[PDB]
Paper text:
Serpins play important roles in multiple processes, such as blood coagulation, fibrinolysis, tumor metastasis and immunity. Mature serpins usually contain 350–400 amino acids and share a conserved folding pattern that is mainly composed of eight or nine α-helices, three β-sheets, and a reactive center loop (RCL). The exposed RCL is located near the carboxyl-terminus, and it acts as bait for protease binding and cleavage. Three homologous serpins have been identified in the silk gland (a highly specialized organ that functions to synthesize and store silk proteins) of Bombyx mori: serpin16, serpin18, and serpin22.
To understand the physiological roles and inhibitory mechanism of these serpins, we determined the crystal structure of serpin18 at 1.65 Å. The overall fold of serpin18 resembles the canonical serpin conformation: an α/β fold consisting of one core β-sheets surrounded by nine α-helices (hA–hI) that are classified according to the conventional serpin nomenclature. Specifically, the segment with residues Glu352–Pro368 makes up the active RCL region, which is folded into a 1.5-turn helix (Glu355–Ser360) and two defined loops (Gln352–Thr354 and Gln361–Pro365, respectively). All residues of the RCL were well defined in the final electron density map, presumably because of the interaction between the RCL region and the underlying protein scaffold. The RCL in serpin18 is situated directly above of β-sheet C, and is closer to the core of the protein compared to those of the classical serpins. Further structural analysis showed that the RCL in serpin18 adopts a more stable conformation, presumably because of interactions between the RCL center region and β-sheet C. Furthermore, multiple-sequence alignment and structural analyses showed that the RCL in serpin18 is shorter by about 7 amino acids compared to that of the typical serpins. Notably, the length of the RCL up to the scissile bond in serpin18 is only 11 amino acids, whereas the length in other serpins is always 17 residues (P17–P1)23. Moreover, the papain-like mammalian cysteine protease, cathepsin L, was also inactivated by serpin18. These results demonstrated that serpin18 might act as a cysteine protease inhibitor, instead of as a serine protease inhibitor. In contrast, the inhibitory activities of the V362G and V362T mutants dramatically decreased, resulting in an extrapolated molar ratio of inhibitor-to-protease, which increased from ~1.3 for the wild-type to ~5–7 for the Val362 variants. This result confirmed the importance of Val362 at the reactive site of serpin18. Thus, we conclude that serpin18 plays a physiological role in regulating the activity of fibroinase and protecting silk proteins from degradation during B. mori development.
Numbering used by the authors: 15 to 392
The structure:
């Protein structure tokens, strides 16, 4: 069991797909800071890519082309083979880290999916379809499934009333990832929680608990992006990046806009230089998120026709009609290993840097693409 599965025939395309993932994470945080500066939040883009990939196997020509442009993939062979590899990775558990990413497609009991869709969803993703009554307790059916299957009880993005007989295709994903810390003598780890003073984006002053953490890492002040960045490994292959503004004014928008370009993260990862890190970070080691991607995809100006009731661009999702996409749910639990009382006693909590204002994080795998991106503003 490992997380380096790659298609050997479409290798370049898999690397390009990771660049699409990296860039979507950038669009995501750029939009969060613009539209939702009051929110602390995090997310993963892999389930969105998987959903769009699935749709790209079942679309008419123009829609297929638009889907391909967003995926950085350009053929059925690429979509199938890249996604089979990445799906395997994101469903592997081993001693290095554990990942689960499971997909469902919902439709009303009287509108069954095409056998073509059911087959390709199973083939590429081990996706499963569910036929439910859109007139009776459909929100609860979905909520209960996501929460039960994932073990994650956070509330879902739907509210009762959101689903009726005119509702179209509903796609869902749940992602559960667990990361242990490195096991080297100087692996960066959290040790103990300490009080810090925090100043929120809107100026609110408060006290927070923060994990005093230390170990080998990397650091840079990156003037052109207006940020300082701290970087450390988990188990080998995995990297966390923490960033925060150079200025007290939290001028983060230029950094987030640049993160829309996948080159920016590759640049960041080389600008940093080795530094022993002693930090205090106000973050929870278990984080949960549940969202509907569609509002964010619409904010980005992408694929807007797919979400209209009159859409006619799908070919083989249904035998009798196009169908349209109503909700794209992503239900996420991110967990980091908890430190022990014995570990706490081994260090003196004297941080060189405290994250005492808005900051962001990315967690990367061995392909240097983010499994998750998060933003803390308050
Ligand atoms: Na470097």
């Amino acid at each position: 069991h490992h997380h380096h599965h790659m298609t050997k025939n479409y290798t370049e395309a898999q690397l390009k797909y990771y660049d699409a993932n990296t860039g979507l994470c950038g669009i995501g945080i750029d939009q969060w800071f613009q539209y939702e500066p009051e929110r602390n939040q995090f997310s993963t883009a892999f389930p969105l890519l998987f959903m769009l990939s699935e749709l790209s196997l079942n679309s008419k020509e123009d829609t297929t082309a638009e889907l391909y442009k967003n995926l950085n993939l350009r053929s059925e062979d690429e979509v199938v083979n890249v996604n089979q590899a990445v799906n395997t990775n994101l469903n592997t558990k081993n001693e290095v880290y554990q990942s689960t990413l499971i997909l469902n497609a919902y439709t009303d009991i009287d509108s069954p999916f095409s056998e073509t869709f059911i087959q390709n969803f199973a083939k590429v993703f081990n996706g499963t379809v569910k036929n439910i009554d859109y007139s009776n307790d459909a929100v609860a059916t979905i909520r209960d499934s996501l929460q039960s299957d994932s073990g994650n009880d956070i509330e879902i993005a739907l509210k009762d009333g959101d689903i009726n007989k005119d509702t179209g295709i509903i796609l869902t994903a749940y992602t559960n990832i667990y990361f242990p810390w490195g096991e080297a003598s100087d692996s960066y780890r959290p040790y103990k929680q300490i009080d810090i003073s925090f100043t929120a984006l809107d100026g609110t002053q408060s006290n927070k608990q923060a994990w005093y953490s230390e170990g080998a890492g990397k650091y840079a002040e990156i003037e052109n992006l207006g940020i300082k960045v701290f970087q450390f490994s988990l188990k080998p292959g995995l990297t966390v990046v923490l960033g925060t503004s150079l200025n007290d004014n939290n001028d983060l928008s230029g950094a987030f806009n640049k993160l829309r370009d996948p080159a920016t993260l590759a640049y960041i990862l080389t600008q940093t230089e080795s530094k022993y890190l002693k930090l205090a970070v106000p973050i929870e080691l278990t984080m949960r998120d549940s969202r509907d991607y569609i509002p964010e995809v619409k904010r980005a100006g992408l694929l807007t026709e797919l979400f209209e009731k009159n859409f006619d661009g799908f070919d083989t999702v249904y035998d009798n009609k196009s169908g349209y996409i109503s909700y794209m749910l992503s239900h996420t639990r991110l967990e980091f290993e908890q430190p022990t009382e014995e570990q706490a006693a081994s260090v003196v909590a004297e941080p060189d840097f405290i994250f005492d204002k808005p900051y962001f994080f990315l967690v990367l795998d061995q392909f240097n693409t983010p499994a998750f991106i998060g933003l803390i503003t308050n």
